Design a protein around this ligand. Sequence first.
Ligand code: ZN
Ligand code: ZN
Length: 264
Amino acid sequence: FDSTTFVKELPAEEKLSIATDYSNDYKKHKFLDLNRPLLMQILRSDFKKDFYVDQIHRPRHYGKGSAPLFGNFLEPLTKTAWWVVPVAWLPVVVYHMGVALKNMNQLFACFLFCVGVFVWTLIEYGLHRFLFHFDDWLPESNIAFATHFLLHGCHHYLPMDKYRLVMPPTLFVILCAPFYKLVFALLPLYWAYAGFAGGLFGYVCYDECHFFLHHSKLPPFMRKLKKYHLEHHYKNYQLGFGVTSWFWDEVFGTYLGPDAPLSK
Ligand SMILES: [Zn+2]
Ligand SMILES: [Zn+2]
């Protein structure tokens, strides 16, 4: 019925794609008007931190189309399809890994690739938990609200927005820039090549997995993970930071079990 209310058990998948009443939403909750650009509506807002963090994680749905962010000619930048990540970054994975296999013991390079994707799983947990869900640690500033919106907020706000799920390369370049420079500073050259290639491929897997968790009927062995992450969306967002695996959730004691309570 009401999509703004969290449930202890996930409702029908058909109710997750129900278009939200715009005017009724802005009237009932006095948050954001979905019929008008959201970003400028945030930069020019009088919201308190707790109010924003409480309302943004209560999912909406614009409908068949995609919600407006800028409303002008900058809007195309905010529409990034699922197939964008592989076609843009997989060729980079291959090249970096390709170089390593031509100037280094191939087996050791393969190993460094694997540790690359492992380190990636860890980074996934770390970013998703501490960076993507900054939440209560946020300052009382609209710029911070907009930034958090761009990073991970908008996805929770409009989950079934098929063009605002994956990370736009414009942002991913910024976020990956520190990791890349760091890897090549510490590790030997071709080691850095292999390792970074691994991490990047891991990222591609992460974004693709994360997408198809929302917009596809996956094979049975992944349906558990789908239920898991969808419970991170519609039940409790203080837990279940692993999207590829709840491994780091078991490790760091943030597993989203059936005994998990609802959020505040
Ligand atoms: Zn998601
Ligand atoms: Zn999240």
